[PDB]
Design a protein around this ligand. Structure first.
Ligand code: ZN
Ligand code: ZN
Ligand code: ZN
Lengths: 303, 303
């Protein structure tokens, strides 16, 4: 019948906790260490307490993306609302890029305006919690689902940014004669952030461009299909992916003309669903006749 | 043979001119009206001459997206590099959102710091060219290809932003007693920008989520297919789209068991390619047997 029905359902549920819990943890931390600013110096933690609101924002946005992904397939969005996950993830990552650019420009400003001073010891304790809080905010998002993996890279990034004042603070406190080791620290650590976002960006860009999923390999799939009896030649094998774990596949095959078709494609479906989980298959089951010199449109992926 | 080979090839060529020409026009304008700043007041046009560089940047980025779209299909990117167009377009539009947010924040700053003054007559002539130049930069991008349509919305947006100082300038010159009609102008006109970007964003988001293309209609396609003789029931009709004009389709059909299959799907392909151009079709041609009460996974798009 070519439609097979808890292994997937439960996973949407786990992340839903791995985010709501992390969002709540960041909520607690932001609340506490902002009320610890009104009842003390009022320009102490707000600047750090800022970032925490950004992380919370990204976490709630990723959770919103999950809730969207839950929605059922419609007439307009046929396959379902799945890629909403990847979309929210890519939006969050571009927001990392934007926020980091903003921070780098403010660092350059502080450089061009060295007329500024901050007590280099209380500057550390405020950094330590920010590092510690980020340590916790990361280890909960330790990968997975495109949504959580987008929140982790978003969290880890803050960690490098978080120490980027601590490791700077110590160098300021232990030798305030320098005063210009902080901007270079923000620079290099923003670059580290950007490297991690480069990894995730490459992966989700390959996803959005209907690229074959990393988890698989095209020529391996052609071998795996052609390794079945009745077939003679498989042309136009396209295999893209939905968010992460919904691999689709669509192929033309040319089988033994006098052979019964439907058993051949049934066997192909069994072989494929045996090697790896699917989400749909539409094998066209063409005939022996094919205009081979003209199949250049479906000769093979050049690569 | 199910593979049919100048109607499409020439279109990549037209836009390639509709961008390179517009990029060059903006290049000319920026050059001229920046050298008209060194040889006069040096804080006159640079701020306007700034956004021209942003428009040029977006135009060259869209052209880069086109050049990517030209690349052939590979083993990793099976369908081809097509959606690179949509990706570059969405990036450019999010950059519109970012730049407009930046401008709105600087407007709020000018508000909270009314300690500032600018001659309200020379402020107009610098605005008029910016409006005129934007008038020209837009009417060349008058739509189409996802790349150009992304450059037009990007250009038109600057127009509203461009007059957003002129219409402000006049009100400053004709009554400098007000001095606070400029921020509200930037506000409302940024909102207009954001509305246009909302339209384009909705469309390309529907595209990226494998939504059926606007140009078509699902139930219309089911009627158009089921209107052919041999078929009995079509389930799991998925029809997404590549960038704009590469519509794909993939369907299971259940036809008369004793009937010859391949003629049925050949006729379906003829009917579809008759109603509207395609880019691929993989009709599975299932049998009469189907487990109807269990097809809930392929019952129909709820909507
Ligand atoms: Zn062919
Ligand atoms: Zn089916
Ligand atoms: Zn079914």
């Amino acid at each position: 019948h070519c439609h097979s029905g808890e292994k997937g359902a439960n996973e949407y549920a786990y992340a839903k906790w791995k985010l709501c819990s992390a969002s709540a943890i960041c909520f607690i931390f932001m609340i506490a260490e902002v009320v610890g600013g009104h009842i003390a110096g009022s320009l102490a933690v707000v600047t750090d307490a800022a970032h925490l609101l950004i992380n919370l924002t990204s976490f709630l946005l990723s959770l919103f993306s999950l809730w969207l992904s839950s929605k059922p397939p419609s007439k307009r969005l046929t396959f379902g609302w799945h890629r909403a996950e990847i979309l929210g993830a890519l939006l969050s990552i571009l927001c990392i890029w934007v926020v980091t650019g903003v921070l780098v420009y403010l660092a350059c400003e502080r450089l061009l305006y060295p007329d500024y001073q901050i007590q280099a010891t209380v500057m550390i304790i405020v950094s330590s919690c920010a590092v510690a809080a980020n340590i916790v905010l990361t280890v909960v998002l330790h990968q997975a689902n495109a949504s959580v993996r987008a929140a982790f890279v978003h969290a880890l990034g803050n960690l490098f940014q978080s120490i980027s004042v601590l490791i700077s603070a110590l160098i300021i406190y232990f030798k305030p004669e320098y005063k210009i080791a902080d901007p270079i620290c923000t620079f290099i650590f923003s670059i580290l952030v950007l490297a991690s976002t480069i990894t995730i960006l490459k992966d989700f860009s390959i996803l959005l461009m209907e690229g074959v999923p990393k988890s698989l390999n095209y020529s391996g799939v052609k071998e795996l299909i052609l390794a079945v009896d009745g077939v003679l030649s498989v042309h136009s094998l396209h295999i893209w992916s939905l968010t992460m774990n919904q691999v689709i596949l669509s192929a033309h095959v040319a089988t033994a003309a006098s052979r019964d078709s439907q058993v051949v494609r049934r066997e192909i479906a069994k072989a494929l669903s045996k090697s790896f989980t699917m989400h749909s298959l539409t094998i066209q089951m063409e005939s022996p006749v094919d205009q081979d010199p003209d199949c250049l449109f479906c000769e093979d992926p050049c690569d």
